[PDB]
């Protein structure tokens, strides 16, 4: 409980809410789900001045992502979709559409904000650990055990991000990950030590 509050406090210096009208209750719910992330990662994001930008509109309507208009994201070949239609982005920045957290809301991630923030943690905090030799070996074995195998089984950075999301969303997804991907589960456990 005290740790939950600390993580929410840290997130108050990371999360940026949009200007104008937006769903305040859902944005709060999204912050609450992010507070389940281990505090070590959240503190590292804050220290790196990583902002989690919540959006009330399309990602590409933000000045800094306008360059992605019409661009097909990695792994989205054949979907008929471009960044204009994608509700979240993670990496050197994080941007998320409010209301699109759940699987099937324009994406098939277990949770939008956790998956996108995992990309930022991978890249900014852990220096692209998902491309390390260690994780590539884990990914070679377990990367096709969580579904969407033409995406999660092909890009180790996506397998990492989604496994991270399973680990931190709730107790049920945490248990599912341990059953399906035990070496990934232990890897993430040891990462958080």
């Amino acid at each position: 409980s005290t740790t939950i509050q600390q993580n929410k406090d840290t997130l108050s210096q990371i999360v940026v809410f949009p200007t104008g009208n937006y769903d305040k209750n859902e944005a709060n719910a999204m912050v609450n789900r992010l507070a389940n992330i281990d505090g070590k990662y959240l503190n590292a994001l804050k220290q790196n001045n990583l902002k989690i930008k919540l959006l009330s509109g399309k990602l590409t309507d933000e000045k800094e992502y306008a360059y992605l208009k019409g661009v097909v994201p990695k792994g989205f070949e054949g979907t008929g979709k471009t960044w204009d239609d994608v509700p979240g982005l993670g990496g050197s920045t994080v941007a998320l559409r409010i209301g699109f957290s759940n699987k099937g809301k324009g994406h098939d991630a277990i949770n939008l904000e956790l998956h996108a923030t995992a990309h930022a943690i991978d890249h900014i905090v852990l220096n692209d650990i998902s491309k390390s030799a260690q994780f590539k070996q884990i990914f070679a074995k377990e990367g096709r055990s969580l579904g969407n195998v033409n995406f999660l089984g092909v890009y180790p950075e996506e397998f990492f991000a989604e496994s991270f999301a399973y680990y931190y969303l709730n107790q049920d997804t945490n248990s599912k990950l341990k059953s399906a991907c035990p070496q990934t589960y232990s890897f993430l456990q040891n990462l958080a030590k």
């Binding site: 994201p73 994608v86 979240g88 982005l89 050197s92 991630a109 969407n148 999660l152 996506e158």
Partner: peptide, 7 residues
Amino acid sequence: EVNPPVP
């Protein structure tokens, strides 16, 4: 770096 969610 930019990465999308699962399609």
